[PDB]
């Protein structure tokens, strides 16, 4: 029973702030509230709470991550970059 045609979670803000700002928020909102896969125990049970802090329900691990998403593009590539450079040092 599809309730809204496009606001979704953003329905809470009614008419205020102007469509476009509500789009932008809706994005990161969806991103931030969503349940994520735990690298460690492998269940999807990582939720947010305070920007950058991502902590896993059962299993109880906490990972520092992006302000509204577990892993951030930049961070990620930096990881891969650090792979590459580390390689250089025992090869």
């Amino acid at each position: 029973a599809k309730r809204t045609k496009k606001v979704g979670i953003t329905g809470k803000y009614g008419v205020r702030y102007g469509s476009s700002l509500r789009r932008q928020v809706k994005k990161l909102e969806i991103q931030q509230h969503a349940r994520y896969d735990c690298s460690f125990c492998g269940k999807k049970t990582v939720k947010r709470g305070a920007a950058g802090i991502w902590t896993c329900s059962c299993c109880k691990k906490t990972v520092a991550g992006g302000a509204y998403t577990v892993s951030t593009a930049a961070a990620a590539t930096v990881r891969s970059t650090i792979r590459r450079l580390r390689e250089m040092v025992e090869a």
Binding site: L21, L28, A51, I53, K61, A64, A67, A74, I82, M88
Partner: protein
């Protein structure tokens, strides 16, 4: 007339910081014997929110080399570090996210955070959520190491200046529209009494260079000299250009 606002901030009364809830001060370990001859292990015991800070802190605990006790440090959490992870601090440490190493011991392109300006100052450069620095040079004689800061500026500092592998966590925080006035309100409530902001141009002359007139207007160039004097410097201070920045920025 009267003392303007931006000179009252200086006596710090209502303008001092709202410190009551903060975890403490983020700093690297002291540059002791271990960290500067070999390395030293720790455990991130907890990563945690700091009121008025973007990025989370990581509580990281170490053994005392000289006494039987635990000594706890307060780190700024690089993205990806997790509770229970082992953190390695030292010249002879290995290059993975979380560990802290002297800019000398990490090759070109290493991406690091919370870096010192002089060795030992326990962390100065790139600490805000998202920011980092990248090593771009080394000069083996007089051990400098060249870096690019988040501002684009490039600086050179001691090769012994410590940094931590990776980028500060919580990035992206500012892509989110604040949406409403109160979300700023609570933001600044846990920072300092800097918000909201009356435009000088809405004040009277007693109040401001910009105040007064029968219409609101600045009445003279709003770009003010460095040699200006307190009570004068409101506007665009020492502004060397002005107007809509067209075309790609980004330092050469």
């Amino acid at each position: 007339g009267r003392v303007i606002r931006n000179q009252r901030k200086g006596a710090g009364s209502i303008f001092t910081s709202h410190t009551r809830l903060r975890q403490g001060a983020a700093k690297l370990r002291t540059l002791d014997y271990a960290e500067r001859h070999g390395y030293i292990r720790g455990i991130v015991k907890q990563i945690v929110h700091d009121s008025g800070r973007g990025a989370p802190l990581a509580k990281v605990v170490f053994r005392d080399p000289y006494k039987y006790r635990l000594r706890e440090e307060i780190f700024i959490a690089n993205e990806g570090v997790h509770t229970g992870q082992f953190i390695y601090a030292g010249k002879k440490a290995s290059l993975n996210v979380g560990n802290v190493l002297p800019l000398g011991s990490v090759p070109e392109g290493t991406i690091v955070s919370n870096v010192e300006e002089k060795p030992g100052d326990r962390g100065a450069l790139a600490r805000a959520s998202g920011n980092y620095v990248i090593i771009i040079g080394h000069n083996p004689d007089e051990n400098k190491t060249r870096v690019r800061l988040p501002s684009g500026a490039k600086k050179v500092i001691s090769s012994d200046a410590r940094g931590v592998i990776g980028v500060i966590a919580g990035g992206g925080r500012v892509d989110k529209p604040l949406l409403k006035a109160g979300r700023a309100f609570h933001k600044y409530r846990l920072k300092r009494n800097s918000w909201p902001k009356t435009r000088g141009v809405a004040m009277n002359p007693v109040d401001h260079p910009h105040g007064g007139g029968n219409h609101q207007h600045i009445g003279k160039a709003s770009t003010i000299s460095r040699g200006a004097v307190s009570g004068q410097k409101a506007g665009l201070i020492a502004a060397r250009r002005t107007g809509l920045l067209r075309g790609s920025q980004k330092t050469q």
